[PDB]
Design a protein around this ligand. Sequence first.
Ligand SMILES: NC(=O)C1=CN([C@@H]2O[C@H](COP(=O)(O)OP(=O)(O)OC[C@H]3O[C@@H](n4cnc5c(N)ncnc54)[C@H](OP(=O)(O)O)[C@@H]3O)[C@@H](O)[C@H]2O)C=CC1
Ligand SMILES: NC(=O)C1=CN([C@@H]2O[C@H](COP(=O)(O)OP(=O)(O)OC[C@H]3O[C@@H](n4cnc5c(N)ncnc54)[C@H](OP(=O)(O)O)[C@@H]3O)[C@@H](O)[C@H]2O)C=CC1
Ligand SMILES: CC(=O)[C@@H](O)[C@H](O)COP(=O)(O)O
Ligand SMILES: CC(=O)[C@@H](O)[C@H](O)COP(=O)(O)O
Lengths: 398, 398
Amino acid sequence: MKQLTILGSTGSIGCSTLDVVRHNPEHFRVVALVAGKNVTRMVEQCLEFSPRYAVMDDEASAKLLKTMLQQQGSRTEVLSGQQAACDMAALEDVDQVMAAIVGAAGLLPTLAAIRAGKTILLANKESLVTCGRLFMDAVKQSKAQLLPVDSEHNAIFQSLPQPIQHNLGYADLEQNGVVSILLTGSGGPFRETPLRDLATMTPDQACRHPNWSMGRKISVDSATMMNKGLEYIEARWLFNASASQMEVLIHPQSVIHSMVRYQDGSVLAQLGEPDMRTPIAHTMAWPNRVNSGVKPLDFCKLSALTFAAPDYDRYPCLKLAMEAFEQGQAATTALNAANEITVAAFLAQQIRFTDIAALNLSVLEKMDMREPQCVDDVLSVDANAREVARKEVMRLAS
Amino acid sequence: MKQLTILGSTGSIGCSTLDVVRHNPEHFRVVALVAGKNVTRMVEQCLEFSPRYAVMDDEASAKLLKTMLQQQGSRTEVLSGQQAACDMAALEDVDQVMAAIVGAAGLLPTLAAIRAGKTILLANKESLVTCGRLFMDAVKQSKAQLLPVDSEHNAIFQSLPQPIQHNLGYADLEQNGVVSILLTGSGGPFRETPLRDLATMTPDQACRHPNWSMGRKISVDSATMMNKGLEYIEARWLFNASASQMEVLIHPQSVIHSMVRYQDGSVLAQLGEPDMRTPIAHTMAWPNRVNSGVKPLDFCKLSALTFAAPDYDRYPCLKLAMEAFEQGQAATTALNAANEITVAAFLAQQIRFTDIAALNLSVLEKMDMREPQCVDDVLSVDANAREVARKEVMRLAS
Ligand SMILES: NC(=O)C1=CN([C@@H]2O[C@H](COP(=O)(O)OP(=O)(O)OC[C@H]3O[C@@H](n4cnc5c(N)ncnc54)[C@H](OP(=O)(O)O)[C@@H]3O)[C@@H](O)[C@H]2O)C=CC1
Ligand SMILES: NC(=O)C1=CN([C@@H]2O[C@H](COP(=O)(O)OP(=O)(O)OC[C@H]3O[C@@H](n4cnc5c(N)ncnc54)[C@H](OP(=O)(O)O)[C@@H]3O)[C@@H](O)[C@H]2O)C=CC1
Ligand SMILES: CC(=O)[C@@H](O)[C@H](O)COP(=O)(O)O
Ligand SMILES: CC(=O)[C@@H](O)[C@H](O)COP(=O)(O)O
């Protein structure tokens, strides 16, 4: 029996995680739930799973949650704020922490779980992207184990040998017969959209992913392929891969979730339904398996599986992420921050869909900070880039 | 340094095996080569790899080989016959034996390697099919290591967890999170051929496999899908799988080589170029990897990947194989024997392509013999089936 804290319980990943728990009450128990502002969902989750604690980051949301749960006779203690989220991630009683807060806001609570030596079920890719080597070193220095939840990285993990799996981030790919890591793939909802129509796409259009039901931020990132850029960076840290050991491949059906090339010509892959309960359950049970609620993939009802080279002209954000990573951590931290601001602006109908990539570039051109030496420096670059991004958004205020 | 005996060196698998040796001369050396009657090829292989011994089954071929080797200055010594092949498989200095003789003729030399405790690179599926549990038990009692070379079984092996890999044939699939084994798939050269045009198909037409360049016997088996039937039986022994843990899937492109379903919905697969050097190299180097000479799979050049359920009515041999396995080992041994006789008669233009399945069923219906309790019994059932099959072929003589 393993006890769990879920960071970001009310969102897409959080709810999928709770469904895996629902299917396996003998194996998993929720001790703490952490979220932002969705009180309605958090009340529902607390009444079902009777967590010891529930945390809302937003102070006013926490007040409402405390009152509502008290009237319902809940035993759950309600806390509030960022520090309480960190406290939950570090509960001495907890074995696993689902890191599923969106954006760099998840970094401090995720780092707290790492310092406490927990098993980190890493969905929140922005935390690793923005923190980089400092993140990976903290996992090694403490007793922590990273298990990749993100679909592609989970697929790659499943398709790697045990010496790599058991020394994630530091083992040598070539010594284990790996030639490269093949990161797929979808292209998003606008893959075939005429280029001239991109400027007038709405938030609802951008968030209708053809294959995955996800949160709004990552759905927009999938439409620009900034998501694939962030995942490229994530893969390089997780699997200790160089630029020459990474391939990006478009696969519009999202059945093959990613692959690994070996020296003898073999390519190992993970396939399945586009359902995050599968990778979540992989990480929660590893090295064993559990029922996730996902049924067997029916190969007789599939679309034909196709592949293609990335259309870099169409998706400037992909190349931007790759070049930021080349430049260094300051540029990468700045780019992630800029993208959080521009995506949020687009969702709030302040800028156009095509302004995301342009404003992201504009922020990078205006920033030239030194490489972070500690987590405080990562946060300074992040904060600075957010401010630059807010000013660029306001310049396009209609 | 690993020293090899290759059973069936001059054939399709044998030549691919020697190309892996050619690419890795610091890792592999050939001690003995065993073949049938292809003297010309054996001469070339002896001159290049300088084996201590060469064995031809054909006594006239051994005579010719000796003369040619002595004329051309080779120090390779020549023997002949089945017993000599068994002796080559059990040499002290031999580490690995490539079992790549076609048909049940490979059984005794393969069993000799097993009893000597060698690493068995098993390509010769008919030996396991015809001997079944007695084969798997011999491996267990002698502490030989079985590594599947057959493309599909190698792909499944690569897609299974370590506890199954390290206890092949005796570990529990369910305890290791496996739901089923997915066996693909091609359908053969007559997949789209109208049923009424099969009667006039020539040996060359049946042997023209759309995806794999192989020996003539297995190529005809792929045309009737008897090969997939034999592979179904092979898979159930190797991976300790029940009928409900097996799935057969048509996959015309032969890019996905086979797959494994897990409890959480995950499907693991191996893909690659349709080139046997890949799986051969995988077994030769295991648990490490080597360059096999096979180029990396170009996903952008691939045809769309498709899947379909088997058409058992078009392919009565596939159904007959699955039925014979449920009936027991006597029926399975008899069917394999019958099919060796009918395929050979078809290749020699004694019977029609459509006579293969018809005569195979006829032989099984006339066969009533006891379950083999030992290898001698397997040989008696096999010999009896061949008699019945030969009689049936002779009745169709023009
Ligand atoms: N959804 C998916 O299929 C995949 C998601 N991911 C990653 O997982 C992470 C979560 O994404 P997703 O679930 O889609 O996003 P959602 O918007 O659906 O959920 C985000 C969660 O984070 C919470 N949250 C936001 N800010 C804070 C804060 N500062 N403190 C505590 N909690 C906070 C939200 O609370 P609330 O809603 O109550 O305000 C919500 O529970 C992202 O990093 C994403 O990249 C990766 C692969 C796939
Ligand atoms: N080719 C492929 O892609 C695959 C093959 N296999 C299996 O591997 C085995 C070999 O197949 P393949 O290479 O295609 O067949 P081939 O016809 O190309 O080769 C058969 C080999 O066996 C030799 N041989 C035949 N009879 C005897 C005998 N009685 N004693 C010693 N050697 C003998 C042949 O000698 P010679 O030619 O000199 O007469 C030849 O070297 C088969 O069991 C097949 O099912 C499995 C998966 C794939
Ligand atoms: C489900 C998941 O892990 C997403 O990160 C996925 O990458 C989205 O699809 P795209 O490939 O279109 O970004
Ligand atoms: C390469 C190999 O292992 C063959 O056995 C393969 O199975 C032949 O193709 P079919 O799938 O058409 O039988």
